[PDB]
């Protein structure tokens, strides 16, 4: 069960236009600030802070999540939850890609896993509201970066 | 499985709204999707029975088709049918109140596919939808409060 959505970073226009570093910047505070990003959140705590390694708890109406993020500077992030019983564990890479200079995109990476396991699609409700993340991420980091 | 997600529509503080305004944006979601939909690039709707749309929405290297019922004033029940490639689902929104101005949509979700444990969304799926749900109702308010 992959899913994954390239975001273009700057465009030709009105709106801001970022350099590689400052992206980064961007995912690096996506990471450790999300209450900019996460529409819903109550609060947020950074349990375990090893730098380049967060052990995080997020605290959403009805939900509590923990995950694990790893940072690879300048180039990505990688979110990811352990499944349990209860939840179902899966991942999150955002990657900066750069095919010319000023030429930026963030590849975002989905994937999902069971402790039980047919390979599985996901469906385009899932899809689409992945791609208004994904779109409102870079959104967030072009107006603070 | 299912996730479900309660949004709470007026609060004590931004637009308050009526039952009959929260109802013509939830249509006003269903019939003009632009205002909702980020990333959408063009839509059609196919077949437009009143209370029953079939609908084709063209996203950004993606298209989907689906239909959608709206029960006026209570709900409006999206799906898709799923097919050998992709993974069907629905989405019902449902408009609560427990006293007169106290307004709730309750979000439920599913998916199905053709060939079948029963098995729960992650996480960044749940923060995603949960995500789309405030939006939603953040922009009703902006467009029907006004």
Wanted: proline share 6%; hydrophobic share 40%; glycine share 4%.
């Amino acid at each position: 069960m992959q899913f994954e959505h390239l975001v273009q970073v700057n465009d030709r226009t009105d709106l801001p236009v970022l350099d590689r570093l400052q992206l980064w910047e961007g995912l690096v505070c996506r990471a450790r600030e999300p209450q900019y990003f996460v529409v819903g959140l109550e609060r947020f705590e950074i349990l375990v802070d090893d730098g380049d390694r967060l052990h995080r708890r997020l605290y959403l109406p009805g939900l509590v999540v923990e995950d694990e993020v790893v940072l690879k500077a300048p180039d990505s992030a990688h979110y990811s939850i352990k499944p349990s019983a209860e939840v179902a564990g899966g991942s999150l890479d955002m990657t900066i890609e750069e095919p010319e200079p000023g030429s930026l995109f963030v590849r975002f990476a989905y994937c999902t896993r069971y402790l039980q396991p047919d390979e599985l699609p996901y469906d385009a409700f899932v899809k689409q509201a992945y791609i208004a993340m994904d779109v409102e991420t870079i959104a967030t980091i072009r107006d603070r970066f």
